């Protein structure tokens, strides 16, 4: 009597992912009080208006 077995497994995983997130803004003011200019031109990203 004689017996043989062979067993083989191969498994592969590959994963990938990317983000690009660009934000730009350029508020511009002429006239009025310099403090109001600077305070308002400063970009409140939550309220760009």
């Amino acid at each position: 009597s004689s017996h043989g077995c062979k067993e083989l497994e191969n498994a592969l995983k590959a994963a990938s992912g990317t983000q690009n997130n660009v934000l730009r803004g350029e508020p511009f003011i002429r006239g009025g009080g310099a403090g109001f200019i600077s305070g308002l031109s400063y970009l409140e990203l939550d309220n760009p208006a």
């Binding site: 310099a34 200019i37 600077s38 031109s41 400063y42």
Partner: protein
Amino acid sequence: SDLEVAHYKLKPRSLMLHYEFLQRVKRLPLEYSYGEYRDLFRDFGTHYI
């Protein structure tokens, strides 16, 4: 943030110099010798606004 608040211009002509600059000029040698004009620039610099 670039904030601009006032525009200045000097008159083109008949400027009234500062005493100190006036005198230092008065003491400049009539013959060229670099050392004195060098000291002049090191005191007052090279240009005016």
